[PDB]
Design a protein around this ligand. Structure first.
Ligand code: CLA
Ligand code: CLA
Ligand code: CLA
Ligand code: CLA
Ligand code: CLA
Ligand code: CLA
Ligand code: CLA
Ligand SMILES: CCCCCCCCCCCCCCCC(=O)OC[C@H](COP(=O)(O)OC[C@@H](O)CO)OC(=O)CCCCCCCCCCCCCCC
Ligand code: KC1
Ligand code: KC1
Ligand SMILES: CC1=C(C/C=C(\C)CCC[C@H](C)CCC[C@H](C)CCCC(C)C)C(=O)c2ccccc2C1=O
Ligand code: SF4
Lengths: 146, 741, 164, 122, 132, 80
């Protein structure tokens, strides 16, 4: 009858509960993503996120980069992916420095300097390893023929 | 109860107020103290709802002003017919439409300007005109200048009648507001009467007059031997010679055997091979079927006889679980606000003009129009511009509605209320869509320019490289090409050859041929999508943030049109919805400019040209669109620089007016930037020094000179910008197309 | 469960369980039955639409090379496409199980419409009934169409083409 | 409840081109630069609301409210000097007569002679 | 005591939680529709109404609109994240446009605007001409 | 915060106070003019700098002057 209502039953907050923001699908997905999932160490959040991203990042470089038509095109795509991961890791590092300062963190929450450093390291490892795994997978594509 | 309510002798007829400039405005009525007054007088002249708080009076003023506009339009049409009757080579063009250039304007010999009277053929000198008058007149069956003279006389009579009707319905018999609020009856009459009877009567003219005259004219009969139009009415044997089913008469119509009329009511499709235009029998069948449809549509709404629909009921019923009260309140809005109606109607009329431009190029409706490349270009471009302006105006008047006629009490939890309640989501998502479209669509071109400059053609987005094929458009093109036998089995040919098929050749020139779509077409269509989305972003932001925003919470109290709310809050210049119209106008200019450039280059490169009897096709620009239009350098070199040759080399010929107008339009466009880039504080300070010089010689106006207002500075800058840019494209197109036609 | 459920009970037949396959089933079992009825119905509706499109010749993918016969196009599709289809549905199913664990979950309600509306509302029950009945019809229709394509050889319309 | 709580911010007024902290303070004493959203079970900043099973919208949960009693009490506290001035010019018990007879807001709104008129009644 | 409002995307943001928030209360004598400054229409309740807003200017725009309803008892507060409140408007119980005894003039300069000193006369002092 | 100054040419017309969108200004008693009141700006922390007060002021030259200075959240009119 009414699929839109104010978020948190608060008419004056700038948000609405719609199927996009508040469906069971959206809630289950978002609560299960490693950026939000209960119980993960910051390092493991970073690792899972890096694993997810580095795997797909190699594709654009491998298939569309300048050396795509050479026989070392996959290797160049992997190198480009590693360079992109380094750029992103620099972004994460300076972000953490700005957002949290340089004082010793008093807690283990992700939004703290020490936890963010752990998360950034996990992201770097996950992304680089995932790019390497995708390189291996793209080295031999199965046709799936018996 | 639908009734006519009129007040008699509403307003005296007198010249007193003609002597009291600004009488309509309480503030402006006191007379001028500064030159600003003068400008204000013109700005507020037709702003009727600010001149009075009575809706009935606004309605009466609008009705009479509409009659005035109709009188002006009739005067314009009558003038065109008179120039065809006395200053044209129409008679000569009738005998040989292919080699004689249409001309309906002649200039007097003075200061050497007579060079503009081109050697257009037919023992006639004048200006080559591109509005399509000769093609339309030939399609109507007009064969003599005397018929044109009579059409012009009738146009004058109708212009006078409209003017008297406007005076009568303002000063003598002014309808009451209850009369105007008759949406149901107005729709019934305008559908069944205006559109339905108009279509039926035009089909009557086409069946009885235009069809046999054009059949004779195509068959090679001289215009001076074709029977006069009334002979076809008084001689059923004359029609039976041409269309044999006329020997049966109206017996099949009332008997129901309508198939008998298949000889003059056809479904051929394609184009007439002799003329290069649509078959007149198809057009007559089209108008007859449309007349029937409109007459049916005009019985939908209830007026006085119990049966029919109430619009408010229909609107109130359409609501769902996502939309609260849905369409409730819309009927009250559209029967109490002239601005809401004007917003809708301008949006529709502009979109319709754009549609007209497309459909008239691809399915050329008049004989010998398709191979008159100058006329085709000018008609497409003109209707594109008209449509762009009208859609922007619809947006502007939507904003005016939001500021002035929107009431919160009448719009609780309806569609309008909920749109206002998620404006932030709407505008943020549209902003993102605009960035995505702009980055990708224009980055294609930038990538291509960089790759070509670096000597890396194989890395470009192109047909010969990384391809971006518009596969959906191609799929649709194939479907339309296959339609004539299968999904439209009674159609003998395709609706338009642009979708596929043979080349239609008239006088050795190509009328229409399939327009193939590749990577360059993909890129340009996404540029069009980008520009339209940005224009919509600006205008929709102007409508949705017209009343308020996080920056200025009380914008509605500042009005529709105000320069700013001061330099505070970081600066609030151009926060008004009028300023959103101002910026949207620039973006519409950008969009339409790109659309008409795409049309011009694509048609010259891939459609228009010559065709030898053997079959060899030679296009105007040699098919360079595919590889040249994929970079900005290719547009700058192969389109602008190359095709500007005619306009810049026109001095000393009949086209020299185009070179002059090209230059003058550049000048006015650059002149606009003074207004757009500056501010009135500087100019007022300069005027102080100039007023000093006048005072130093004992004279100065009591109407103190003032720099233009902020909003007038913007308006003037934009008006000169549009005039300059559009006029430049106008001169360029006309010189180019007159050369290539 | 029979005195609690209202969705799916509709005109002609009212409550329809002649075989008595619902008597003596616990609430979890009947929730499974409703979730299965809905999932089979939704899959069958999607299958019917896809089959009709393919049979009509509107299958423009792969340069429209695949056969108009859907059961032939099933085998002409490479293995990797089916692997993607199965794994993508599997991921969706995993998320659906996560949704199913949630309290107050209504069997078959992946969207979680219970956050906004319940069966005390007439129109929502009616629209749920429309979904359910069309699902039942589409389950029968997909089985029948598969029969007609396999044993009768014809993969198109055999009911309304004979009219026109 | 302290009245200068707003003024006790970290805004250090510049020596020129700066109106400083006026009647209530130039800015909030709370540092607005806080962390973004946080995983399930964690808080982004000190007083942040626990978004429960939806921490991504945690910032849409309100931890700042104005209950009517606090409103009345801060109304009285912030206008105590204006009421003191009005009794000083009209002239403890008299103020309690006036502010209960007609109201506190009305006592602020009236005039010293008008209150001299309403004090005529008892 | 919230008015009848279905919500919008125009309401307050994280700042209301971490920097400052505003509240306006008022008394209506009937249920009447009004325009939310954040976009859309809300229904006032018979009796006391309370509304939260991101900016003081929004509260004052709403109060200006309330004046057209003949409602003059509105009060405007600022609320900090700790829960401390500041009573903002009308500051002394009397509207600022109506002169009130007990107010002291702030920021007056006892001369016409044309008597401010010359900039070159206060160079390197750190002051401006309008503050000296 | 912006600076708002009142000069002694003020005639106590109360128009700047009514124009102010953020309640920066108020009328206070004063014996310098016929109306017996002068404008005051005790709450410049809430001044956005719109200059509506200056637009409303009838004297020549202005009696209320807004000089823009150090920007804050309040002076920038930010809802975020
Ligand atoms: C903006 C439009 C645009 C596009 C689409 C391209 C595309 C390309 N450029 Mg070009 N280029 C451009 C503008 C563009 N360029 C501009 C403005 C310049 C400067 C003048 C250049 C200068 C340039 C040079 C010098 C070169 C290129 C090259 C390339 C190619 C490789 C690039 C690459 O690997 O990136 C990697 C891409 C990514 C890492 C990510 C792409 C974005 C992802 C796919 C978006 C995914 C979003 C997802 C769908 C959202 C939802 C997902 C889900 C979670 C829900 C590629 C074809 C290279 C080439 O050799 O061309 C053949 C090359 O050497 N470009
Ligand atoms: C539809 C609009 C229209 C337009 C743009 C034109 C344009 C033209 N006509 Mg055509 N014409 C038209 C309709 C039009 N006509 C109609 C309806 C008729 C039938 C009457 C004609 C019959 C006609 C003839 C017979 C001729 C033209 C000619 C011309 C050309 C020269 C005009 C000229 O300079 O006269 C002279 C211009 C003036 C004297 C300017 C006077 C302007 C007045 C004083 C200002 C009016 C302002 C305001 C209304 C008055 C306020 C003050 C007042 C109350 C005192 C020019 C291209 C001539 C031509 O083509 O030569 C080859 C020519 O011979 N026209
Ligand atoms: C400033 C406004 C403006 C100007 C100066 C022009 C100028 C021109 N128009 Mg254009 N036109 C405009 C706006 C304008 N148009 C708009 C907004 C539309 C969209 C409706 C059109 C649609 C249009 C069509 C379909 C045609 C023209 C044609 C022409 C040319 C011949 C003039 C003529 O008398 O034909 C007279 C017009 C006809 C003989 C055909 C009219 C057929 C339409 C469908 C009639 C619609 C009338 C209907 C009652 C309007 C209500 C719409 C409804 C939804 C409510 C001339 C260049 C004609 C042309 O190019 O000839 C070579 C032509 O065929 N125009
Ligand atoms: C079937 C009868 C009929 C016809 C033919 C029209 C036609 C028109 N009306 Mg409508 N009108 C009608 C019934 C009709 N009306 C009724 C019953 C009402 C009351 C509900 C209205 C209330 C109304 C209003 C408020 C307005 C109109 C307007 C118009 C004009 C619209 C602009 C246009 O596209 O003109 C195309 C131009 C032509 C078709 C040229 C021919 C014009 C003549 C006069 C048509 C009549 C000839 C016919 C033989 C009689 C058009 C002339 C608008 C207007 O412009 O008024 C001045 C306008 O503002 N009408
Ligand atoms: C059906 C068409 C239509 C109608 C009836 C109206 C009616 C109105 N408009 Mg709207 N509008 C329209 C279309 C329309 N408009 C379109 C298409 C646009 C987009 C451009 C707009 C954008 C718009 C804005 C931004 C505003 C209006 C406003 C108005 C109102 C005041 C009109 C006035 O006093 O101007 C008097 C008329 C003039 C001063 C003439 C101006 C001349 C123009 C600028 C240049 C003409 C160039 C000429 C053709 C070429 C000369 C070349 C030569 C010199 C070489 C009036 C209600 C105003 C308003 O406040 O509404 C309440 C307002 O601010 N309109
Ligand atoms: C050619 C000059 C020019 C350019 C480049 C722009 C660009 C833009 N305008 Mg502006 N505009 C212009 C003229 C221009 N405008 C003029 C003259 C006016 C006065 C009328 C305006 C008034 C105006 C308004 C009212 C609005 C815009 C908006 C926009 C943005 C549209 C969204 C978009 O597509 O972003 C994409 C960016 C581009 C298309 C530019 C280049 C993209 C490159 C080629 C690809 C990506 C490169 C990438 C960033 C890598 C960079 C490498 C670098 C680090 C070295 C875009 C940034 C709108 C907006 O902001 O919407 C969201 C908007 O509402 N403009
Ligand atoms: C969804 C409902 C549905 C509909 C409308 C049809 C329609 C049809 N069935 Mg089918 N049928 C269906 C499902 C359906 N079937 C199911 C679920 C089965 C069990 C597998 C069958 C088993 C079946 C057999 C054995 C035969 C039909 C046949 C037919 C056709 C002849 C009419 C008839 O038998 O009654 C007609 C096209 C006959 C046929 O195919 O004619 C060529 C036929 O021999 N049906
Ligand atoms: C291809 C054309 C342009 C496509 C743009 C984006 C493609 C994405 C698909 C969107 C189409 C379906 C929209 C929802 C389906 C739809 O048609 O309406 C479905 C639904 C209608 O709800 P009800 O059944 O309550 O409707 C009762 C009606 O009577 C309305 O009163 O609308 C909504 O749920 C809210 C609509 C906003 C939904 C926003 C979605 C994103 C919109 C994108 C912007 C649109 C651009 C068009 C502007 C003219
Ligand atoms: C009541 C619901 C309904 C469904 C669900 C349905 C489905 C299909 N119809 Mg049928 N159909 C009607 C109704 C329905 N049709 C009606 C009222 C008429 C009279 C106008 C009618 C006539 C024809 C003709 C002449 C053909 C036809 C076909 C298909 C085929 C391709 C679908 C597509 O792609 O559009 C799918 C199975 C074609 C065919 O069988 O090709 C081998 C074909 O040639 N239909
Ligand atoms: C994660 C992002 C993503 C990418 C980047 C991607 C890409 C491609 N998909 Mg996939 N897709 C999903 C996601 C993605 N797909 C998901 C979640 C599902 C389950 C709902 C799914 C289902 C199918 C099916 C049924 C088919 C299919 C195909 C292709 C193929 C087409 C080019 C080609 O292979 O010629 C390209 C590479 C077709 C195919 O592979 O045909 C042999 C095919 O039939 N997909
Ligand atoms: C140039 C310019 C001016 C100065 C231009 C002015 C004042 C226009 C002058 C118009 C004239 C006076 C009217 C037309 C008269 C002819 C130019 C000369 C004829 C003189 C008499 C017959 C009246 C502004 O005032 C302005 C304001 C805001 C933004 C930009 C600008 C801007 O760019
Ligand atoms: S006066 Fe001019 S510069 Fe100043 S805020 Fe207004 S529009 Fe902007």
């Amino acid at each position: 009858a009414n699929f839109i209502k104010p978020y948190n039953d608060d008419p004056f907050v700038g948000h609405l509960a719609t199927p996009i923001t508040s469906s069971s699908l959206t809630r289950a997905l978002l609560k299960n993503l490693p950026a939000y999932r209960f119980g993960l160490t910051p390092l493991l959040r970073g690792l899972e996120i890096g694993l997810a991203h580095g795997y797909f990042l190699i594709g654009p470089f491998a298939q569309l980069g300048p050396l795509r038509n050479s026989d070392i095109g996959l290797l160049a795509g992997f190198l480009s992916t590693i360079g992109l991961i380094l750029i992103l890791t620099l972004g994460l590092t300076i972000y953490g420095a700005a957002a949290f300062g340089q004082e010793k963190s008093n807690g283990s929450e992700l939004q703290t300097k020490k936890s963010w450093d752990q998360f950034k390291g996990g992201f770097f490892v996950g992304a680089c390893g995932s790019a390497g795994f995708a390189f291996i997978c793209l080295s031999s594509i199965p046709t799936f023929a018996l | 109860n639908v009734q006519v309510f009129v007040e008699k002798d509403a307003v005296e007829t007198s010249f007193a107020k003609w002597a009291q400039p600004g009488h309509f405005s309480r503030t402006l009525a006191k007379g001028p103290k500064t030159t600003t007054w003068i400008w204000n007088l013109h700005a507020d002249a037709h702003d009727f709802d600010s001149q009075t708080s009575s809706l009935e009076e606004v309605s009466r003023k609008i009705f009479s002003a509409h009659f005035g506009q109709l009188a002006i339009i009739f005067l314009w049409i009558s003038g065109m017919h008179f120039h065809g009757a006395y200053f044209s080579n129409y008679s000569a063009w009738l005998t040989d439409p292919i080699s004689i250039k249409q001309s309906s304007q002649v200039v007097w010999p003075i200061v050497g300007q007579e060079i503009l009277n081109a050697d257009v053929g037919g023992n006639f000198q004048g200006i080559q005109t591109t509005s399509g008058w000769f093609q339309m007149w030939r399609a109507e069956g007009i064969t003599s200048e005397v018929e044109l003279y009579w059409t012009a006389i009738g146009g004058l009579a109708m212009s006078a009648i409209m003017l008297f009707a406007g005076w009568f319905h303002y000063h003598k018999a002014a309808p009451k507001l209850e009369w105007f609020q008759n949406a149901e009856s107005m729709m019934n009459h305008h559908l069944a009467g205006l559109l339905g009877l108009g279509c039926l009567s035009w089909s009557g003219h086409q069946i009885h007059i235009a069809l046999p005259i054009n059949k004779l004219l195509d068959a090679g009969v001289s215009p001076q031997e074709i029977p006069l139009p009334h002979e076809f009415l008084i001689n059923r044997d004359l029609m039976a010679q041409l269309y044999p089913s006329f020997s049966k008469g109206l017996a099949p119509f009332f008997g129901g055997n309508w198939g008998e009329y298949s000889d003059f009511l056809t479904f051929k499709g394609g184009l007439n091979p002799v003329t290069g235009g649509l078959w007149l029998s198809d057009i007559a069948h089209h108008h007859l079927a449309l007349s029937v449809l409109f007459i049916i549509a005009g019985h939908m709404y209830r007026t006085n006889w119990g049966i029919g629909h109430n619009m408010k009921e229909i609107l109130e019923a359409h609501k769902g679980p996502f939309t609260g009260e849905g369409h409730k309140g819309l009927y009250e809005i559209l029967t109490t606000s002239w601005h809401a109606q004007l917003a809708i109607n301008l949006a529709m009329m502009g979109s319709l003009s754009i549609i007209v431009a497309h459909h008239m190029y691809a399915m050329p409706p008049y004989p010998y129009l398709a191979t008159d490349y100058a006329t085709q270009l000018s008609l497409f471009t003109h209707h594109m511009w008209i449509g762009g302006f009208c859609v922007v105006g619809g947006a502007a008047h939507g904003a005016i509605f939001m500021v002035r006629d929107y009431t919160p009490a009448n719009n609780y939890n309806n569609l309008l209320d909920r749109v206002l309640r998620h404006r932030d989501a709407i505008i943020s998502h549209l902003n993102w869509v605009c960035i995505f479209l702009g980055c990708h669509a224009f980055g294609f071109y930038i990538h291509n320019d960089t790759m070509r400059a670096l000597g890396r053609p194989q890395d470009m987005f192109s047909d010969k490289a990384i391809q971006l094929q518009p596969i959906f458009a191609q799929w649709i093109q194939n479907i339309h090409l296959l339609a004539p036998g299968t999904t439209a089995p009674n159609a003998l040919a395709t609706t338009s050859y642009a979708f596929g098929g043979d080349v239609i050749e008239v006088g050795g020139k190509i009328a229409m041929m399939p327009i193939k779509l590749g990577t360059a077409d993909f890129m340009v269509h996404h540029i069009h999508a980008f520009t339209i989305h940005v224009t919509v972003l600006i205008l929709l932001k102007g409508v949705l943030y017209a009343r308020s925003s996080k920056l200025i919470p009380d914008k509605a109290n500042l009005g529709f049109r105000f320069p700013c709310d001061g330099p505070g809050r970081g600066g609030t210049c151009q926060s008004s919805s009028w300023d959103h119209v101002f910026l949207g106008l620039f973006w519409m200019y950008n969009s339409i400019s790109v659309v008409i450039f795409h049309f011009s280059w694509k048609m010259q490169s891939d459609v228009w040209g010559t065709i030898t009897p053997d079959g060899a096709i030679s296009h105007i620009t040699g098919g360079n669109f595919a590889q040249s239009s994929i970079t900005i350098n290719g547009w700058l070199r192969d389109f602008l620089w190359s095709q500007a040759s005619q306009v810049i080399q026109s001095y000393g010929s009949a086209s020299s007016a185009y070179g002059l107008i090209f230059l003058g339009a550049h000048f006015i466009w650059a002149f606009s930037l003074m207004f757009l880039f500056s501010g009135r504080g500087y100019w007022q300070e300069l005027i102080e020094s100039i007023v000093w010089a006048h005072n130093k010689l004992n004279f100065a106006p009591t109407i103190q000179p003032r720099a233009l207002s902020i909003t007038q500075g913007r308006a003037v800058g934009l008006a000169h910008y549009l005039l300059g840019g559009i006029g430049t494209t106008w001169a360029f197109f006309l010189a180019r197309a007159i050369s290539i036609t | 469960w029979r005195d609690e459920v209202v969705v799916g009970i509709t005109a002609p037949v009212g409550f329809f369980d002649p075989l008595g396959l619902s008597k003596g089933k616990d609430d979890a079992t009947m929730a499974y039955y409703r979730e299965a009825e809905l999932k089979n119905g939704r899959v069958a509706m999607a299958a019917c639409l896809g089959w009709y499109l393919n049979a009509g010749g509107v299958h423009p993918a792969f340069n429209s090379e695949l056969s108009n016969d859907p059961l032939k196009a099933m085998v002409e599709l490479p293995a990797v496409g089916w692997l993607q289809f199965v794994l993508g549905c599997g991921a969706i199913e995993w998320l659906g199980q996560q949704i199913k664990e949630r309290p107050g979950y209504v069997p078959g309600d992946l969207l979680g419409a219970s956050y906004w509306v319940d069966n005390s509302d007439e129109g929502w029950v009616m629209y749920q009934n429309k979904e359910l009945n069309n699902g039942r019809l589409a389950m029968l229709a997909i089985v029948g169409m598969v029969y007609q394509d396999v044993f009768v050889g014809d993969y198109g319309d055999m009911m309304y083409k004979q009219l026109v | 409840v302290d009245l200068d709580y707003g003024m006790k911010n970290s805004y250090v007024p510049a020596t020129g081109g700066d109106g400083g902290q006026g009647q209530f303070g130039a800015q909030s004493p709370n540092d607005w630069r806080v962390a973004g959203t946080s995983p399930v079970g964690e808080t982004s900043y000190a007083g942040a609301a626990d978004g429960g099973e939806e921490p991504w919208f945690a910032e849409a949960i309100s931890t700042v409210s104005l209950d009517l009693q606090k409103a009345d009490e801060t109304l009285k506290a912030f206008t105590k000097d204006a009421a003191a001035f009005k009794i000083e010019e009209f002239a403890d018990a008299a103020m309690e007569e006036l502010v209960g007879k007609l109201g506190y807001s009305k006592f602020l709104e009236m005039s010293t002679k008008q209150l001299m008129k309403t004090w005529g009644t008892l | 005591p919230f008015p009848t409002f279905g919500g919008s995307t125009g309401g307050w943001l994280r700042a209301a939680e971490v920097e400052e928030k505003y509240a306006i209360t008022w008394t209506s004598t009937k249920e009447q529709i009004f325009e939310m400054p954040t976009g859309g229409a809300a229904i006032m309740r018979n009796g006391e109404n309370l509304l939260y807003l991101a900016r003081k200017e929004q509260c004052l725009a709403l109060s200006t609109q309330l004046r057209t309803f003949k409602i003059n008892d509105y009060k405007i507060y600022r609320i900090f994240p700790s829960g401390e409140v500041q009573y903002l408007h009308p500051k002394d119980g009397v509207f600022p446009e109506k002169v009130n005894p007990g107010r002291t003039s702030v920021n007056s300069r006892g001369f016409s605007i044309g008597k401010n000193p010359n900039p070159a006369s206060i160079k390197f002092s750190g002051i401006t001409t309008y503050e000296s | 915060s912006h600076t708002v100054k009142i000069y002694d040419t003020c005639i106590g017309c109360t128009q700047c106070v009514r124009a102010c969108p953020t309640d920066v200004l108020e009328m206070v008693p004063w014996d310098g003019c016929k109306s017996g009141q002068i404008a005051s700006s005790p709450r410049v922390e809430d001044c956005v700098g719109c200059k509506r007060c200056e637009t409303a002021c009838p004297t020549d030259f202005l009696s209320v002057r807004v000089y823009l200075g150090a920007e804050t959240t309040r002076s920038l009119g930010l809802a975020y």
